[PDB]
Amino acid sequence: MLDAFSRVVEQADKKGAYLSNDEINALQAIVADSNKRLDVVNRLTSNASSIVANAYRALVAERPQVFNPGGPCFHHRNQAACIRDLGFILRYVTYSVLAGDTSVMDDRCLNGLRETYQALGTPGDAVASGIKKMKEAALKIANDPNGITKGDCSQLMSELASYFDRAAAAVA
Template sequence: MFDAFSRKVATADTSGKFIGGSDLDELKKFISLGNRRLDAANFIASNSSCIVSDAVSGIVCENSGLTEPGGSIYTNRKMAACLRDGDIVLRYITYAVLAGDASVLNDRCLNGLKETYAALGVPTASVGRAVGIMKAAAVAFVNNTASQRKMTVTEGDCSDLATEVAGYFDTVLKSIS
């Protein structure tokens, strides 16, 4: 598990080089975006219950068979597990945003997730759709364009950070498909 600094140091050490040039520029950019990164993590964490519940509600609205007898989230226990899993994925994405690196997401959350869902008979298409809905909501929060949920933010353009956040969700989607 690395953060942006650890990854640069480990890469430089492996190749027997000093950190400099473009690596140093990337770390300077990471530092300059620090407050925006903290704002993004705060937005996602502060609204996590809304993001996850909206995503699960969305997949249920799109496929009402999920909550019927025999459906993937028919019982309260299965619904609670679905909400819990969404919350866990979102929490690790928040950690990745803070670290500026997806390794915590890959190592602690996604490793074996597809196989676990397959063993439990959870349709990955539904999981993927819920992750897609969470992605759209999280990106809206990072860009501070989420309707009726605006927060005071650090001034500046967050499009690069929004792209980074979207990339973490794409990593989740890749791991379960």
């Protein structure tokens, strides 16, 4: 498993060189916005249950055929499995905003996921739609101007939105 600091160390080791001026500075930039990064990691965690629950409610509305009889997700076992999987994606996107690196989401979550869904009969484009809705629902909560010191956390929203996009392009 790798974090943002250890990603650049693994690259620095592969060329047998110490970190350069630009490599220490771009990493010092992460320590500089770390307070805002941890605010994002807290907001997604606190509203975890809420983000996955509503993204589902929106997905069933967008694709009703999928969740009722004859669809890939009918039965209580399946409805729970879908919410669980959406809760997994979110939990790993949260781990990625913390690490600053995407290896955690990649290694133990997204690996043979497209293959799992293909072998199970689960769509993929419907899981991508679910992840996309979780993105929209996560950006509202994470960038809420209320109850926080006012500032700019744009590069965090861009990065957070990219991590959801990476999780959707892996199932579609």
